[PDB]
């Protein structure tokens with residue numbers, strides 16, 4: 001590969017899980033279980049292990065609103081650089097809620113609080 005390997009079809013596959021209690025609460029658990037070590041708690045790359053990798057962990061806060069549910073989901077599923085694909089360990093519910101958590105927090109930090 002030479003970057004992001006994700007099929008456009010699955011990019012438009014919006015995770016069939018309503019962003020709410022289960023997505024955000026449970027998603028936070030799966031997030032703090034795995035993602036925080038590189039993407040951090042504030043989705044800004046606050047991860048301690050994010051300093052011993054090669055590719056940029058990216059500012060999910062800004063990245064997530066610009067990306068689609070399926071796109072982000074597939075990357076957690078199959079992997080994205082130094083992060084292994086969790087699609088074999090985690091189920092759809094785990095990853096789908098992860099994306100909802102990511103999307104919600106990112107958009108919340110992008111929109112709410114910003115007057116410009």
Ligand code: HEC
Nearest residue numbers: 034035038055056057058063072075076080081082083098
């Ligand atoms: C360090 C080993 C990581 C852990 C742990 C997790 N992620 Fe990650 N992620 C990492 C990198 C270096 C990158 C970018 C590499 C690239 O090819 O661009 C990413 C990217 C993502 C993305 C896509 C964001 C974007 O490219 O705009 C998503 C959606 C993502 N990561 C999700 C994610 C989740 C849910 C994790 C916990 C289960 C997680 N990552 C852990 C590095 C690392």
